[PDB]
Design a protein around this ligand. Sequence first.
Ligand SMILES: Nc1nc2c(ncn2[C@@H]2O[C@H](COP(=O)(O)OP(=O)(O)NP(=O)(O)O)[C@@H](O)[C@H]2O)c(=O)[nH]1
Ligand SMILES: [Mg+2]
Length: 169
Amino acid sequence: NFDYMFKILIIGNSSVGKTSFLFRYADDSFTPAFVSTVGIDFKVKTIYRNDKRIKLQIWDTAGQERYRTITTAYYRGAMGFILMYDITNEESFNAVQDWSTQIKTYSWDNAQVLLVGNKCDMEDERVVSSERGRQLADHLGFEFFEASAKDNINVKQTFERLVDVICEK
Ligand SMILES: Nc1nc2c(ncn2[C@@H]2O[C@H](COP(=O)(O)OP(=O)(O)NP(=O)(O)O)[C@@H](O)[C@H]2O)c(=O)[nH]1
Ligand SMILES: [Mg+2]
């Protein structure tokens, strides 16, 4: 049913929009409701790149600290990570460094990572500049993206770039 299968994990503080990000990408759907993820969830999505069928096993992790042990247990085997924060939430941005270290502690075999500042549609409520996001991504050695699960801005682009760097690894 596939030529390659890439395991991808979406991590970051609770409420940054990780589930919404996946919901938009996999089902082209979005819900304004906040239904916190219990531990970890996943969605499989088959994409077609260079005439090849790549199965994307996407794990949607819970952001709350109490689920750290449950979620980090899935880091090994992950080939790509979407480290997400909310442009309207400073605390979620300040947590990026620690999320980055978490990836280093539990990930294996040079997993690829993209830093994503979600909810970019909330321009009037923005608290973290794109400049700061880009600057942190650079220092962490990650490529940067700002996106919107709500307005469907850069969700596909984010996932496709991740698939590219994983494939070209
Ligand atoms: N305006 C806007 N709201 C968004 C966006 N993405 C997600 N949200 C909203 O932010 C809230 C939390 O989103 P959710 O996807 O549940 O976040 P999460 O990071 O998965 N949470 P947890 O880690 O607690 O499971 C929801 O109310 C959702 O509608 C976005 O791009 N724009
Ligand atoms: Mg969630």
